[PDB]
Amino acid sequence: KSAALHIDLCKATSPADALQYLLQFARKPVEAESVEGVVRILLEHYYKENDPSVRLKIASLLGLLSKTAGFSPDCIMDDAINILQNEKSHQVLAQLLDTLLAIGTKLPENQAIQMRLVDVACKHLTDTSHGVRNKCLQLLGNLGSLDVQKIIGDYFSDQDPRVRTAAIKAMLQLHERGLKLHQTIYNQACKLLSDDYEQVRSAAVQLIWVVSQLYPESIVPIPSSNEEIRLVDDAFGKICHMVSDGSWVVRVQAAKLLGSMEQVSSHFLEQTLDKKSGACGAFVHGLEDEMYEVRIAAVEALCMLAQSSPSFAEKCLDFLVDMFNDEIEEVRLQSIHTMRKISNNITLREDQLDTVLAVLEDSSRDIREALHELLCCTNVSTKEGIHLALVELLKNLTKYPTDRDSIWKCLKFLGSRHPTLVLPLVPELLSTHPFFDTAEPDMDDPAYIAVLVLIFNAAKTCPTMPALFSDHTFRHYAYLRDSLSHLVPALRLDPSQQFLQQSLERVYSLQHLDPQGAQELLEFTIRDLQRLGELQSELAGVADFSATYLRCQLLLIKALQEKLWNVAAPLYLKQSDLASAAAKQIMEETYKMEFMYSGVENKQVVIIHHMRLQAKALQLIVTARTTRGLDPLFGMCEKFLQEVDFFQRYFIADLPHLQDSFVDKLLDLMPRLMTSKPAEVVKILQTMLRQSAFLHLPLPEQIHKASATIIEPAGESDNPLRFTSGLVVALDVDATLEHVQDPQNTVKVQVLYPDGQAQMIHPKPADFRNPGPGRHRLITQVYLSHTAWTEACQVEVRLLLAYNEGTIPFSKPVKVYIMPKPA
Amino acid sequence: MKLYCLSGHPTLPCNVLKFKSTTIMLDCGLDMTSTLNFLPLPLVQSPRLSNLPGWSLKDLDKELKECSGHVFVDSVPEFCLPETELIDLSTVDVILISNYHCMMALPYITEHTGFTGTVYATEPTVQIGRLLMEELVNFIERVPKAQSASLWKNKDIQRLLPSPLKDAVEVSTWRRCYTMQEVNSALSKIQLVGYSQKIELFGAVQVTPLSSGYALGSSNWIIQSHYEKVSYVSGSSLLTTHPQPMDQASLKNSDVLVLTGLTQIPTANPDGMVGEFCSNLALTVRNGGNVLVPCYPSGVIYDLLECLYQYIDSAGLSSVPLYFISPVANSSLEFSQIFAEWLCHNKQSKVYLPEPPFPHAELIQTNKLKHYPSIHGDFSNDFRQPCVVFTGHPSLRFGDVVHFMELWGKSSLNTVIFTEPDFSYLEALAPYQPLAMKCIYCPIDTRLNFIQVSKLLKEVQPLHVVCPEQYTQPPPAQSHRMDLMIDCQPPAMSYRRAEVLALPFKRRYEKIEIMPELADSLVPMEIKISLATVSAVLHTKDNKHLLQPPPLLSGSIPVEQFVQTLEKHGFSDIKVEDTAKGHIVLLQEAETLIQIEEDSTHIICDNDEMLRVRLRDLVLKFLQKF
């Protein structure tokens, strides 16, 4: 409020109470139109106030207010610049410069305002306070014609190091805005690389990278030697020298920018790996530091440089594969990813492959999957390495069953690339005795099945492989080509949509039938749509959506036929009635179509809400059939009418599409329903429900059901989880979620113990992973605890979707046995 | 000269001093007591807490829950941050961390507030703080709860709520727990500093951490600008603790001594309370009951563990297990072990011969102490009923302590023993009040009490003392103990939350260096004391001033000496005019004139230029520049 703030600031004591009131006021937001009055009052009190802290807080607040919504601050910058000119204290001046920066950023399209702002920034740029100069340089960086570079460049020699950092950052931000910096900035920045403060050096190396990228082919002469050198190579040398900097943050920055440049000459690129232009052994020293962050930056830099230069990649192969022995987890993941990235330009050596194999023993899931992808993309030159890879993969097959899938796929890709290396190893692996018919291996053994996958993907390119197959090898091939055609390759040894549309048109056209005929037609079509959803995968969403809508309609007409079977209210029988159950079922199904499906445009949401309104009317009528109280009847009646009014308000643009609908005819006789008796309202509601027309459901172009599959607990063949009495047992849950746009806020995990108690769990976003589009992966732990049990019962664990309150199940329930034995 | 106090909590301060050209943040602090207004986070959804009756008002109901009269919030616990909007934290150049307890809230400052400065702390403080944020984030995100509760924060609604919820302050500024990405980002902006290490901040001020003796890596800071020194005394201890004792000597000659981190419950002697805690748990264990000890994983747990190791052998209770459940349990034990050079002379002498410093390694070796990462792992297999468990947050709002309180709360045999004084043990215990569990409060606070700080003040003699206003008054529980006060010869000015103190320590005479080349050209004189004149060019670099080589005069020239001495030093035809309180001397060559006033002289030239310089130089025979 304006006058309230004015009088409160007037009556409050100057030093502390006014500061507290301003602190309270700053938190609560202010409407855009009222900003002018409150900032005028704040300016008036700024003039009145003598305390520096209160004026500082006023400046900070009235800078905050300039960011509020689409408020136009072009009317509040003359008084702002005036008070800035009149301000004496340094904190208040710096805060006012911050406010001016906020106003300028709020109006970037305004030119004259920005020229005034940069002029006044230049005016206060000579203040003795480093903060004032920092804010002035920030103004010059964010705002500036694109002279300003010279003005900012003058402060590369400022005595305060943080003013120097501010100037370099201002020049960098000017470059980012689109300005083309001058080559003269290079020599100024070069002097700053020897500064005694790490922030100045970091900003200077950033600026030197920028200027080298701007003028790479320009020639810079060496001071002592009479040698003409390109600017990019000189900058490469300067940054390489910075990889030996004492501070690790400067080293990280140097490695990153060294990665970012690719215009450098070949010999300079080769120099950073040789032992013994001060760029000799730059990556050698930058790959073996104590800090892991600089090593990650150097690894990524090696990735970019090797992608730009395959000849460089050949030299980088041994250095990068030696890095695999590094025992920092993120370091080795990044090394894996970079090695996979440069995989197209390289081929591993014998001893390098021996090195990486000797330290290939991985435990965690993420590192193992990364290695699988690397081996998918890898290139090797020795078959002995292929044998060792097979040995390690079968060890990781017997060790981790859940790794079988990715190792089968891995070997599928490994053989397709290396058929020549697998050809000697084929009789080494098939155990084909020369002069004996060998025993037929177990066709269910995953290791053996992966040996066949490898040997068959290799055989695709290799005529000579079909020869060395044994008889059972041919038999086994014929099976896995049919059963696993996505892994095994072939060797050298629409009506659904039309039916859906036809069925829906058949339902829509035949709405003049008698109730028995109408409901049997609906049952036929619902069964047909359910079966079509079962058959087709892509049309499962559409079929289930339409079948849910038709089931809602079928329940509605069945309930109305029950109402026709119903008689006068005091004779109503609860046990034989199923209309209330029908209304509840339509409620839950409408929620299901709203939330448990994707690709739902508003044209379907209006129909879902219309069916919801029909269900609410049905529930109201059924309740009226029973209740003898008049006050609750009036309450539910006016609640339903309010719901109708809200529906009309929200979907006002969609009413012409709802001709002859329940809500349309309801809105026709709106005030009469408003002023009628509850019994009369119930009667006309019943008659209008019965005479309502079935609304067509406009199908979306793309729609998929939200599905989930719990896979980690699996069947109950496992032994019960013991020793849980009183304490907790953690059950690891893995699940694949299909077509859930916002699973984190909606997916929940429900646990049902064998008693009536039910637990509801809200997984954190970190549990959810997104390996693909519309296909999530949920990994988490759900904690279970209960008292001691005489016998090992089973607890049901299910995934639910939540909507806004209320929840609906959308996953198949699984059960696991727990034996909380006491001790 | 200025001091912005961003937190009213005494033992969790957050003070920024705009002193010289740098604004230095002293500690961060996280007022964890706001969590006591919220319903506890259980590891497994309990039937008691879920079925609690909602609170009734004329209007909401699902946000607030009532348990045994007290009214709580059915939402994720929130933490009261220091006032971040009072001063733009982008202007903060340096943050100094004293303790790992004061290390919390640092992710908020570093990430959300646009702070681009530096953080300085000692390595044990950094490691233990990392463990604390690890376990806090683990507890909060273990079984996440929504933040649906926002109506009760309204200004006009909070007034009608009962006392614990009505008296909460800065409720709108409360925030949920920081994520682990923010923790990792924040600890990346830290510089490790050892004790007595002189860190220069932009060539302006020098900061050194000095050992406080309160905890591992606990440090007091002294900021000085070569003439004015500001001492920051955080939580410190003068007892026989493991860390090296307080470095009281370095706090002398302090213009301002900002003083925080004084003990809560000053009437308690920590040795007696440790003995009482041991005796109580021994009594409970002897009767077959269990013992629950809510504690931090790395704080006072080690001292009471040592005392328990000594006590059980005489008490004949070696059979019972000593469980320590926390996600950072093994990390806490290992970090406590390896920081051997950060100990006192008695315990750091264990590095000469091969022996770990702390004795709980022997507890582990004899399988007396058993540390676990959680309840669901090997703990549920190795659990024996008559046991003692150190776990969970002392706030009793998250961690395994919630599960153990819900488990053992129904029996009178079991006991819960509170040792951390930073949480009101009646208020933390509020969401479980109808329990039959035996609740014992024997807090162990080794921090400075008011007698100790009075003695330290008389030893140090600071010119001005800054402390929270809570220490300038007796505690409200007593309200009549004049001994529980900070008594100083100066009034010892104080502060409250979001108060700005204008310190009177503004002084002149900043230091400057003069190089030998210019000192060769500088020559002194004699006065009544030595004095010289300097004309040079000033060169400033990194807030260090250097004097590079490129009106007033004083002396004794009375009227009698003026007339007599210089009468015939080279000129002639000189007359004296009988002027009052002086004499006027002028020459007939061109009416050149010399006039003297009281303690002053000046030379007049009339149509003459060549003789004027020599006229001035003649008077300069005995005129200095004093």
Side-chain angles (χ1 to χ4, degrees), chain A residues 25 109 185 206 346 432 443 482 485 571 589 607 700 710 796 801 815:
Chain A
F25 187 80
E109 79 297 312
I185 313 300
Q206 190 72 245
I346 59 184
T432 51
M443 182 65 147
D482 292 339
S485 66
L571 271 42
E589 299 265 43
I607 306 296
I710 300 162
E796 176 175 306
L801 264 164
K815 311 154 190 293

Side-chain angles (χ1 to χ4, degrees), chain A residues 27 91 130 159 164 726 757, chain B residues 4 21 83 170 542-543:
Chain A
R27 291 167 204 155
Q91 305 178 111
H130 69 80
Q159 65 93 0
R164 266 170 291 172
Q757 193 209 331
Chain B
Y4 302 86
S21 57
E83 204 72 46
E170 314 300 327
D542 298 345
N543 306 311

Side-chain angles (χ1 to χ4, degrees), chain A residues 172-189:
Chain A
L172 287 163
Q173 205 289 348
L174 273 180
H175 164 247
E176 99 168 54
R177 279 174 74 232
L179 181 57
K180 193 213 293 177
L181 310 188
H182 310 136
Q183 205 191 117
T184 67
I185 313 300
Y186 169 83
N187 307 271
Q188 314 203 52

Side-chain angles (χ1 to χ4, degrees), chain A residues 274 278-310:
Chain A
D274 293 327
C280 213
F283 267 116
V284 172
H285 295 323
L287 275 161
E288 65 185 19
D289 322 67
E290 313 136 297
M291 270 286 340
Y292 83 96
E293 200 64 29
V294 53
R295 271 173 285 173
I296 284 164
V299 161
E300 274 286 304
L302 263 202
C303 162
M304 324 203 77
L305 282 192
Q307 278 171 225
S308 161
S309 180

Side-chain angles (χ1 to χ4, degrees), chain A residues 90-91 128-131 159-160 162, chain B residues 1-2 17-24 93 200-206 223-230 509-512 542-545:
Chain A
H90 295 325
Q91 305 178 111
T128 61
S129 160
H130 69 80
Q159 65 93 0
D160 216 308
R162 71 207 105 170
Chain B
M1 63 142 185
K2 269 177 176 82
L17 60 154
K18 180 239 179 166
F19 141 81
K20 202 155 172 191
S21 57
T22 75
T23 74
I24 288 158
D93 300 299
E200 201 87 30
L201 312 184
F202 319 107
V205 295
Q206 299 98 76
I223 309 103
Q224 54 198 340
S225 157
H226 228 305
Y227 281 89
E228 46 267 88
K229 182 162 99 173
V230 180
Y509 309 115
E510 177 72 1
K511 192 148 272 176
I512 189 162
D542 298 345
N543 306 311
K544 267 191 290 300
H545 302 294

